[PDB]
Amino acid sequence: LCLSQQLRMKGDYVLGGLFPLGEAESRTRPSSPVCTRFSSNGLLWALAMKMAVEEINNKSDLLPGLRLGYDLFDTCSEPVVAMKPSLMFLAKAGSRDIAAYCNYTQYQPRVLAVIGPHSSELAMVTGKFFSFFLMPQVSYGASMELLSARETFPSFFRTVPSDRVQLTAAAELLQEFGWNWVAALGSDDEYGRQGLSIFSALAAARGICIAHEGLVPLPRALGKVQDVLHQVNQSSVQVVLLFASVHAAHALFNYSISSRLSPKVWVASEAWLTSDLVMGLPGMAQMGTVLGFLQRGAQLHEFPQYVKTHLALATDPAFCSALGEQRCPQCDCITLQNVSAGLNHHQTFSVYAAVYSVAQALHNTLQCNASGCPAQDPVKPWQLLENMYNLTFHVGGLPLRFDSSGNVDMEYDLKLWVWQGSVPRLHDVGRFNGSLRTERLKIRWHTSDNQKPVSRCSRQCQEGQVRRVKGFHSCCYDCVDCEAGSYRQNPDDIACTFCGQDEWSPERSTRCFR
Amino acid sequence: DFYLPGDYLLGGLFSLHANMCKEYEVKVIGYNLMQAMRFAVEEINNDSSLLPGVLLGYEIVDVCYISNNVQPVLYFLAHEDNLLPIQEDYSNYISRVVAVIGPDNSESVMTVANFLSLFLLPQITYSAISDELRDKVRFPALLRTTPSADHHIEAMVQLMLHFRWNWIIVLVSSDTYGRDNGQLLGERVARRDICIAFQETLPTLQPNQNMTSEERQRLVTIVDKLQQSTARVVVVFSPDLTLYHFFNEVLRQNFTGAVWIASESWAIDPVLHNLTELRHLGTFLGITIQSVPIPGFSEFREWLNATLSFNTILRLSGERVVYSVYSAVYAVAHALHSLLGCDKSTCTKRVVYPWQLLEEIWKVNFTLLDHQIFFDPQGDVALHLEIVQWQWDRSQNPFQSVASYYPLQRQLKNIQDISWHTINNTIPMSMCSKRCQSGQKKKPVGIHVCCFECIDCLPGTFLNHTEDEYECQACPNNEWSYQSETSCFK
């Protein structure tokens, strides 16, 4: 194939890209590492961006008379290798040097925007470096709530919903179904830590508060996993929230099935709600119910045909000759089976939307009209940043808008696991726009009589009882009434002094009478 | 004062203003730290046995806390005329500087390291503690001259073991500092038979601002929860410039009686120390770095407006972090001396690529003011820690030593006398459940192991403490026993 030669097309305005094309299988010299192993997802996403750019060029209304271009690059999911092309994007056009100045407005970057990485870890590293120059950056996968701050990431936009909306929806589901007593568990990555940090506040501001807050260890080549479940089993909770990555969830469920753990309602994140690894574990049907939230979006319906057509064209000897007229040297030898596994991924739309958004922003900033468009000097990268906040760009007949924080707004669906044999299925019971709308007659719980499980506490001990405070933040109380053998001398002081010989007092006695 | 030519140059990043870069309140800590660096450079130049002939210069730049982080690094990495080549092998790139004395805050340290890794340019930090900085795969060219946070937590736990305290409250700020430190302390406590009553997050505020009713309600609820529990030892992981409102609220009510175990952030701070009304809340203990006198420093320093204002304070304190900068400069000097192969009176001069200094730096060994300077495999030097109590009489220092900590042993030693706040200088007490009588068993209550109830055994039973203490055994055979008897009387 001749794919590795179609990652650069000249144009009046050139976009840039960063995709995880390759994977890598001790530093003694200042040299760039080398990756060789091939991954199909990166190539599919690169081809999605290419499709988007060609679609824009073919049309007439958008950027009439101007032709775009791109410059794709590899990250290898490693900051050291991802920094170099990032340093190249910001350079004096036509040269191989970068200059040191005091501020922007003295640079002439050779690109106009960047379609950022898929990983949040690399997003954080590259966003800081780009924010110095105010180079707009749009990411298609990074979903972290730390990246919404506008004091550290002024020029960052993302086309994937943040992690706050999912947790808010989970909190509202918990509050509506009547579940004050819960247990929150998260993974040992940054993912889980930030998830717990958000959820604790979201819950404490709504009447829910947690019995235990723990971190499930990662499978980094088992003893601690025992401790976490002991604490959960020691609080009488019938609901557990699991905001973890796929491997931690797999380990947790493997251990739980290996032993005998009681059924419980599990609230999932988007990582392991649809992972074949978890769904295929034997015995999982005896663990209980599993709910969650999944986003709603379109899906490109010409991408599968596009990939076939372009691979077939690449096979043509004539094209390679003309094409001549390597970032990824290992993608010139792949076949259709090596990519057939993922020709229905749901992030091609994200890449496509990011490209369309930058295109529309440029259209507006140029004061392009419909067919001709005004003569002016080139637009600098920091001039699109004013037309990108509050921008309503149409992609595939679905209006979208950025916000002040830089995020887009998307809806959600509530998924439930229903078993028909040994194959679980995903059904719908609700929707989440800004307020939850659930359906309750379409749920088959794991209990004997198909009745809603109960996990509740008591926030106010009635007069005539002692109260022992419980909870990880001291919210609820365990009420106990002293027998006909003592008084209730004080509301506090959890202890009952015994009546006197001359006195007499029944149960629920404030004082003993003579 | 921010430049000196020489054969080989060093970089420096200190936070002179932190509150363009010339728009905030001055910070004197940055100034005396920079003075420490300059003093070290001049002293090395004066001596005629460390480096003969090879002069040494510096190049300092401000950072304005986490504001300015990209320009200084791009400035340090530039041949000359301010242009930096981009290529695929920097093994022959003679940069402007040869090493960086990294910034103060952890986030800035990570941001600068993520850049300097490509070129393997040695970088030494002097005040940033976080276990994430020990991952030598992500950060292959970073070293540190202060201990990490696990040692601070160990000092806390051993202080809590020496005096019998197993019922404590933990408060944390809403940032990475507080979150990580609280999680680490919880993990440590879980293995030492100590309990945590509850945990709470302090709302993030700043001095010189107005708050909403919601934040005031949050503070009120937190203090009300504090003044209902039986635990009387509070550990606070948070930075200064957030605790003023909290302590004002606590003073508004009458919450009296507690041991406030501070952390490095506000262990030594004057502004919060000057709130005179604090004296009647309880003992105040903190964890800091032991101070090493530096012969002949005030001569170089005194010889600007803020420095004179607290010159009394900068005399009482401020010597707690300058040794770090001193040691880092000397370590770079000795690494260079070993690399160049110089001798007592002969030197050679040569090309020195930055990635070569790192190998020599890793293996230095020497003595500076009676403290050995060698790096452990994760890039640390073991310096003793300390525990300080806040004394309010103005005669002597306002931070008096009470104990010493030895990192290479994990032990508290040489514990002196502490003036408590109780009636007759008795040790404050914090326990969940009182000890049982003789012969009575344990009745567990709640979820914490350290909380329990006492119960008396009935006749026909005996309690063998050597065996299950939660249930007494039935006196077998013809042996007999009655209430509260561990021995039978056949």
Curated annotation (Swiss-Prot), chain A:
Keywords: Cell membrane, G-protein coupled receptor, Glycoprotein, Membrane, Receptor, Sensory transduction, Signal, Taste, Transducer, Transmembrane, Transmembrane helix. Coiled coil: none annotated. GO terms for molecular function: G protein-coupled receptor activity; taste receptor activity. It is found in: Cell membrane. It comes from the Eukaryota. The keyword Cell membrane applies. Belongs to the G-protein coupled receptor 3 family. TAS1R subfamily. The gene is TAS1R3. Residues 494-503 are annotated as: Required for brazzein responsiveness. Putative taste receptor. TAS1R1/TAS1R3 responds to the umami taste stimulus (the taste of monosodium glutamate). TAS1R2/TAS1R3 recognizes diverse natural and synthetic sweeteners. TAS1R3 is essential for the recognition and response to the disaccharide trehalose. Sequence differences within and between species can significantly influence the selectivity and specificity of taste responses. GO terms for biological process: detection of chemical stimulus involved in sensory perception of sweet taste; G protein-coupled receptor signaling pathway; sensory perception of sweet taste; sensory perception of umami taste. This is Taste receptor type 1 member 3. Forms homodimers or heterodimers with TAS1R1 and TAS1R2. Residues 1-514 are extracellular. One of its GO terms (cellular component) is membrane. It comes from Homo sapiens. Glycans are attached at residues 58, 103, 233, 254, 338, 369, 390, 433. The keyword Glycoprotein applies. Its main location: membrane. It is a multi-pass membrane protein.
Curated annotation (Swiss-Prot), chain B:
The keyword Transmembrane helix applies. The lineage of its organism: Eukaryota, Metazoa, Chordata, Craniata, Vertebrata. Its main location: membrane. Coiled coil: none annotated. This is Taste receptor type 1 member 2. The keyword Kinase does not apply. Keywords: Cell membrane, G-protein coupled receptor, Glycoprotein, Membrane, Receptor, Sensory transduction, Signal, Taste, Transducer, Transmembrane, Transmembrane helix. The gene is TAS1R2. Residues 1-490 are extracellular.
